[PDB]
Amino acid sequence: ENHGTEDELPNYCFPLGGVINTETLTKVKPKTNGWEKDATEFSDKNE
Amino acid sequence: ENHGTEDELPNYCFPLGGVINTETLTKVKPKTNGWEKDATEFSDKNE
């Protein structure tokens, strides 16, 4: 009795921390238009 | 009433576009034996 399957929604296998392929960024504060590096409080490498 | 599981077929979690690990190739047409690059109708970056 082949009814097919109730699969209107997609189901996903997800990574361990929710994300794997994060990239390294640097905290940047605005000049007091313009931007400069904010390394005093935050670290220079943020994934 | 432990009968094990009916898992004779493998079940896979598949990528969202079918494939993610493509490589960049270039369309090549044959000479009149030999091979030469086709870039007029086709591109040079085909995933």
Work out the end-to-end distance of chain B between its first and last CA atoms, rounded to an integer number of angstroms: 51
Joined tokens for residue B26: 């270039």
Number of H helices, E strands in chain A: 0, 2
CA angle A10, A12, A18 (to 5 degrees): 140
Could you identify the residue written with the tokens 């997609």? A10
Query: At what resolution in Å was this solved?
Result: 3.2
- Report the structure determination method: cryo-EM
Joined tokens for residue A9: 């929604």
Distance separating alpha carbons of residues A32 and B2, to the nearest angstrom:
70
Joined tokens for residue B8: 């004779």
Q: Are A13 and A32 in contact (CB under 8 A)?
A: no
Q: Which residues contact A43 (CB under 8 A, 6 or more apart)?
A: A27
Joined tokens for residue B24: 């960049």
Q: Are A25 and A44 in contact (CB under 8 A)?
A: no
Distance separating alpha carbons of residues B39 and B28, to the nearest angstrom:
8
Distance separating alpha carbons of residues A19 and A6, to the nearest angstrom:
28
Could you identify the residue written with the tokens 């079940």? B11
